[PDB]
Amino acid sequence: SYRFPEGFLWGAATAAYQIEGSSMADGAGESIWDRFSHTPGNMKDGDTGDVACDHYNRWREDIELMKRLNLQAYRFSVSWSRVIPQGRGAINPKGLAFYDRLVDGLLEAGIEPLATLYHWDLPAALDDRGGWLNPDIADWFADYGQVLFEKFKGRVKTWGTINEPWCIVDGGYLHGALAPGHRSAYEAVIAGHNVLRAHGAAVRRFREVGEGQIGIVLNIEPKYPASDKPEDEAARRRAEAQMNRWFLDPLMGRGYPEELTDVYGAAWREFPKEDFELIAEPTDWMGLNWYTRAVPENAPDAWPTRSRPVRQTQHAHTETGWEVYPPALTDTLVWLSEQTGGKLPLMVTENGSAWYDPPHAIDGRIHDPMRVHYLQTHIKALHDAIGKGVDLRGYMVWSLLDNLEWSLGYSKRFGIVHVNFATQERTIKDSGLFYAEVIKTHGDVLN
């Protein structure tokens, strides 16, 4: 049987810059992605988030779609620069009003709104003050958090602080593939620390003025052994430490992983103890974003982890080049349960896959059998995790809509709903239809 526990929450997820469009509309400020996406060479095919899914204007239709998919929850992000154009100071009434209407529309539809404070779109005005390199950001973020905490008190009960610190730092400051496009280990170390601090500050502020549950959202990519060679095991631990333990360990009060000292070398720093007290501020829940695993081997020229993944040719790969391997989800869920002591309620805040779909519907249909396969096998893997005692409270499919996959542009479709970006026409994919059955039957359809 695959019936899920009582109260288990099924939903789907999005992010502001990836779907909203209208980036400068109605008072909204400039974000780092406004700058980044309009700089030549940064984005595939020169794609930008200027229009995206036009969600800012078509959110009502999108909610009708959520209802057709039988969604019980919708996880979304709030654009900081849309709400506070300069990052600090005067609030933008219309910008806040958008999310106000959105949340009311969701509650009317019977859909639980899951809000994320930061999904990679820092206000440019704050980037001009150093962004995540400026320790004061811990306060800025907190204040920003407060604006929402008070505005949606009693309506938004489940809060995420930061979405994937590792992507923000590794993509934004270490390798520069993401906004703000810096490439520096020194900056990567500092930015990671201040992201954690910002999370802690926001949680404290939430304790003072908020109502409900708050937590961080981490992505994890489990690193499997390439061989029994010791240099490869050392490589595996470097990669695992840099990607999976960098943020989790200090969040659990265990400090930074020792291996980071080797990974970042002269760029590594010692931080004040009270910083770690702030960072480990107790949370109510944790989100896991999960897609795949990796099999790292030693790679002396790979900066900075000196490791590289070994291609697992025995399995299918997504268009983002990610191995399809459902058991590794179960394992990860087990592992995380151990790291949090079984004491912290967990939720899969993102899971999904990118495969090729045509740019238009084919007489009113999009047939994506591999996305369907991914969905069913990984959800079964969730059931396996719950059977092993992991406290899993919910599952959010990434993503509700085909959207802007950041620097990879619109070429990577993660949606269970197809978006024709020429016409903004939405078409429910076979995967969405199937997910609607999984929700409807509460998992029994997998039988």
Ligand X SMILES: OC[C@H]1O[C@@H](O)[C@H](O)[C@@H](O)[C@@H]1O
Catalytic site positions: 164, 350
Cβ atoms of 92 and 82 within 8 Å: the answer is yes
Q: CB of 420: closest distance to its own copies in angstroms?
A: 20
Closer CB to its own copies, 1 or 313, in the complex:
1
Joined together, the tokens standing for residue 340 give: 């949090």
If one asks whether residue 3 binds its own copies (CB under 8 A), the answer comes out as no
Nearer to ligand X, 118 or 206 (CB): 118
Query: What is the maximum span of the chain, computed from C-alpha positions, in angstroms?
Result: 61
> How many binding residues for its own copies (CB under 8 A)?
11
Is residue 94 a contact point for its own copies (CB under 8 A)?
no
The item of ligand X, its own copies, none sharing an interface with residue 40, based on CB under 5 to 8 Å by kind, is none
**Of these, 153, 311, 360, 388, which contacts its own copies (CB under 8 A)?**
153
Q: Helix/strand/coil (H, E, C) string of 375-394? A: HHHHHHHHHHHHHCCCCEEE
Q: Which of 5, 26, 61, 67 binds its own copies (CB under 8 A)?
A: 67
Going by C-alpha positions, the residue among 100, 77, 83, 72 that lies closest to residue 29 is: 83
List contacts with ligand X (CB under 6 A).
Answer: 15, 18, 163-164, 167, 219, 289, 350, 398, 405, 414
In sequence order, what E strands does 207-366 have?
213-219, 286-289, 296-298, 307-309, 346-351
State the Cα–Cα distance between residues 353 and 358, nearest whole angstrom.
16
CB 359: neighbour CB atoms within 10 A?
A: 13
101-120 residues in contact with its own copies (CB under 8 A) are: 107
| Minimum distance of its own copies from residue 106's CB (angstroms) | 11
3-state secondary structure of 294: strand
Q: Assign residue 303 a region: left if phi > 0, alpha if psi is -120 to 50, beta otherwise?
A: beta
Alpha carbon 191 to its chain centroid, in Å, reads: 17
Half-sphere exposure of residue 409: CA atoms within 13 angstroms, side-chain side: 12
441 contacts its own copies (rule: CB under 8 A) = yes
Minimum distance of its own copies from residue 25's CB (angstroms):
26
CA atoms within 13 A of residue 382's CA, in its CB half-sphere: 35
Positive/negative CA dihedral, 12, 13, 18, 19: positive
Q: Using CB under 8 A, which residues numbered 421 to 440 contact its own copies?
A: 437, 440
CB of 275 to its own copies, least distance (A): 16
The distance of closest approach from Cβ of residue 129 to its own copies in the complex, given in angstroms and rounded to an integer, is 11
Name the one range near its own copies by CB under 8 A: 153-161, 227-235, 258-266, 286-294.
Answer: 153-161
Residue 157 touches which of ligand X, its own copies, none (Cβ within 5-8 Å per kind): its own copies
Judged by the rule CB under 8 A, the positions of this chain that interact with its own copies are 67, 107, 139, 153-155, 157, 437, 440-441, 444
